[PDB]
Amino acid sequence: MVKQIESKTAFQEALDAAGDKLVVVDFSATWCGPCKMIKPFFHSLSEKYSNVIFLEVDVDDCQDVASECEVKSMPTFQFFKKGQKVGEFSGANKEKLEATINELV
Amino acid sequence: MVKQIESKTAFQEALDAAGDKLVVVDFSATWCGPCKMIKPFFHSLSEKYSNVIFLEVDVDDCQDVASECEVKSMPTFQFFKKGQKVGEFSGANKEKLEATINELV
Secondary structure, three states: OOEEEOOHHHHHHHHHHOOOOOEEEEEEOOOOHHHHHHHHHHHHHHHHOOOOEEEEEEOOOOHHHHHHOOOOEOOEEEEEEOOEEEEEEEOOOHHHHHHHHHHHO | OOEEEOOHHHHHHHHHHOOOOOEEEEEEOOOOHHHHHHHHHHHHHHHHOOOOEEEEEEOOOOHHHHHHOOOOEOOEEEEEEOOEEEEEEEOOOHHHHHHHHHHHO
């Protein structure tokens, strides 16, 4: 299920502990409408794909992580495999989220 | 020069007091890179076009205004004439900002 990130150290330690597994990070903001609309579906994906790690970073909480990951739209999903970014898109598109997970797993 | 908005009442009162003038609102976030990159140029435009009102809304400060204006990218520029939205785009594009101001003034 979804891991809540509350520091840059925790973000890095998570990308390390993932090993060979795909990591999907949702960068979101609480005030932003599309973020709220997609949160339940992002949590259902985490129950459906045991083999993929799902992280949530609130950009207001972790402005340093947000800045460093160069986020500028919400939600933004970034995909990582062994510390490397292998995909990214923004917008609350359900079909695209899952289709990207299936391409990258 | 640029007016700092710190409430929804102040945002509404500003759109009222503008009368027939174009209002350009920059929705930004302090942590976001492109926002910081374009801030000086947005302030130079405000000195150059006396006849246009330039407002700044920090989306962390005025999450209600941000939500209601349905912002989801930073920076987002929204353009208003007599309380009505007449244009919008996002991204730190200098030429486009000024070209839109000249189309709408």
